[PDB]
Design a binder for this molecule. Sequence first.
Ligand SMILES: [Mg+2]
Length: 86
Amino acid sequence: IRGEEGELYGVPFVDDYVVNTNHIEDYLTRYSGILPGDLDPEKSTKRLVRRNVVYRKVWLLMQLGCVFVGHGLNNDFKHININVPR
RNA sequence: AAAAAAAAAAAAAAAAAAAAAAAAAAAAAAAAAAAAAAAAAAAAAAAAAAAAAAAAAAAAAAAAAAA
Ligand SMILES: [Mg+2]
């Protein structure tokens, strides 16, 4: 979401669910609260894949000087496998 | 006229040198002189002389998530 003050202050530009191919063990609804929303005909979302689209998006926002506020982001970036600098 | 075979098997043979009382020399200070198997027989590995071994390297984490 756009953390900058403006007309889209806090308005998302990404709310994307995962195009996941194989079987997923845990839904982790106590940790994530997914529907599961990772259905392709039952999207109810922009069910979008990382493969060069949104990984490029976050990578470019890393690249351009757009700092990433939020909570507990360190291990999040680890499980992403992005290495956001200091 | 003491005048002997002139060398197998790589045969085989020389030395390449001394107490010197020559003249009026006492009784081991040597540094130690020191042989036995063979009835189926003697039998260290680790790396081998402590002539001076202080020998607990602090700890504390109230706990996660990730709605
Ligand atoms: Mg958390």
